[PDB]
C-alpha cells in the first residue's frame, strides 16, 4: 500500500515540527549529529531516511521546505468531519489543521435538532447528504468522530462516494478498499507512555530484586 | 529521564494494542515473524524491547498471546491507577473525559477545572466542573498524577507552571504547542498533526516517486 516503509513515514513529520522551531530560531544549519540526537533516532537512520527521498549538516531552510513537499504540505485539501458530538466539534474548532492547509467543508450529524446549526461558519448537515455533498464538492478526507453503531456502514459509503483517505477517531477496525487510506487515531498509544514513566522507577525495582 | 529509550518505549503500547484484539479473538500464539511483519519492527528488535523487562515464561519460539499481553500490560504501570484532572471544560475536554473512562480502567479522573464562572457546578461523567483558580489546591489535596491540559494556547504555559508548582508529576498535553516543563516532570505532547500529515504522505506518494 505505500513506496516507502510506514515506520519511515510516520518519523517525516516529527523531523519536520523540529525543523519548522529550527527555521522560526533563524538557525541556518545543524548537523546530523544534533538531529540523531533531539530525534533519538540513529543519525544513519535519519539519514537513511532522508536517502528514501535523494555537507556542512543539514540547510535548515532547504530540508525543511523539502519535508514539507514530501509529506504533501504544499497542496490544501478538503475535508469533512462525520460526527457532531465532542470529538468532532473539538476536531472542527483545532484550528491549527486549517493553518496547515486542511479545509473544512462540512459537518454532517444524524441528529436532525443540530441541521443548519454552524461551528465556525462550517454548517451541521444531514449525513443522509453526505454522498450528494461529496460529489459536488471535491472532497479529500473524511474525517471520523461518530460511535461505532453505524460506523463501518458510514465508512463503506464515503468511499463509495469516491473519497481516497479516511482519518479515523474511532477505536475500531474499519476495512477499506486497497485504493484508500486509512489512518486510525490510537490516543491510547500515547497515554500509556505516561503511566510507563510514572511507574518506571518501581518496576526496575521490583524485577531487579 | 529515563531507564529505556523513547523509541523503546514508544513501541511498547503498539506492541500491547495489536496483541489486546489477537486475545480478544481468542488467537493462543504469535510467531516472531508474523509479530514483526504486523507492527513494521524487526523480529530481533521485539526481542530487544521485550528483554528491556526480564524473561516472561517464554518457551520455543513466537510468543503465547495472553501471557505477553499481560506482561506488556504490567511493563506499561497498567496494573496501577492514576489520579487524573482535565483543565478545559469544551469540547475537547469532555472528549477527553470521555475517551479516559474507556481507559478508566486505570486513569481515575477527579475533578475538570475552567476559566468560566458559568461552569463552576456542572457535571460531566459524574465529575463536577471546578474553577480552575481551586487547582492547585485541590491537586495536593487529592493526590493528582497526571493533569490533561485541554485549553487554549492563550495562558497554556501559564496553567502548566501552576500544576508543576503545585506538585504535579505528569502533563498530557492536547494543545499544539511544546510546553516547558522541570525535567523531572513526565511532559507528553500529543502531536495529532503527525497523524495527519501521514494521510497528505500517502496521498502523494505515487506522484511524488513519479515527479522525482
Same mark, same amino acid.
Given at each position: 500500500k505505500?513506496?516507502v516503509?510506514?515506520?519511515v ?27 540523531s ?5 540513529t543519525?544513519?537512520?535519519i ?28 497542496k490544501?485539501? +478538503?475535508? @469533512?468531519?462525520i $460526527? ?5 466539534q473539538?476536531? =472542527?474548532? %483545532? &484550528? ?32 443522509e ?7 459536488? +464538492?471535491? @472532497?479529500?478526507? $473524511?474525517?471520523?468522530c461518530?460511535?461505532?453503531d453505524? =460506523?463501518? %456502514? &458510514? ?11 479516511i482519518?479515523?477517531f ?7 478498499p486497497?485504493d ?5 487515531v490510537?490516543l491510547?498509544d500515547?497515554?500509556?507512555?505516561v ?9 526496575f ?5
Amino acid at each position: 500500500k505505500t513506496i516507502v516503509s510506514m515506520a519511515v513515514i510516520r518519523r517525516l513529520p516529527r523531523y519536520h515540527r523540529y525543523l519548522e522551531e529550527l527555521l522560526k530560531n533563524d538557525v541556518k544549519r545543524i548537523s546530523s549529529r544534533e538531529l540523531s540526537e533531539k530525534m533519538g533516532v540513529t543519525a544513519s537512520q535519519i539519514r537513511q531516511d532522508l536517502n528514501n527521498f535523494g555537507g556542512y549538516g543539514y540547510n535548515v531552510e532547504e530540508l525543511y521546505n523539502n519535508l514539507t513537499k514530501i509529506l504533501g504540505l504544499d497542496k490544501t485539501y +478538503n475535508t @469533512i468531519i462525520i $460526527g457532531a458530538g465532542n470529538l468532532g466539534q473539538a476536531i =472542527a474548532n %483545532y &484550528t491549527s489543521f486549517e493553518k496547515s492547509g486542511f479545509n473544512l467543508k462540512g459537518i454532517f450529524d444524524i441528529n436532525p435538532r443540530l441541521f443548519g446549526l454552524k461551528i465556525r461558519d462550517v454548517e451541521v448537515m444531514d449525513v443522509e447528504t453526505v454522498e450528494d455533498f461529496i460529489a459536488r +464538492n471535491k @472532497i479529500d478526507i $473524511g474525517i471520523l468522530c461518530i460511535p461505532k453503531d453505524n =460506523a463501518q %456502514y &458510514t465508512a463503506d459509503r464515503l468511499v463509495r462516494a469516491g473519497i481516497k483517505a479516511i482519518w479515523n477517531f474511532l477505536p475500531i477496525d474499519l476495512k477499506v478498499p486497497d485504493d484508500v487510506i486509512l489512518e486510525n487515531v490510537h490516543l491510547s498509544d500515547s497515554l500509556f507512555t505516561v503511566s510507563y514513566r510514572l511507574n518506571e522507577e518501581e518496576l526496575f525495582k521490583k524485577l531487579k530484586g
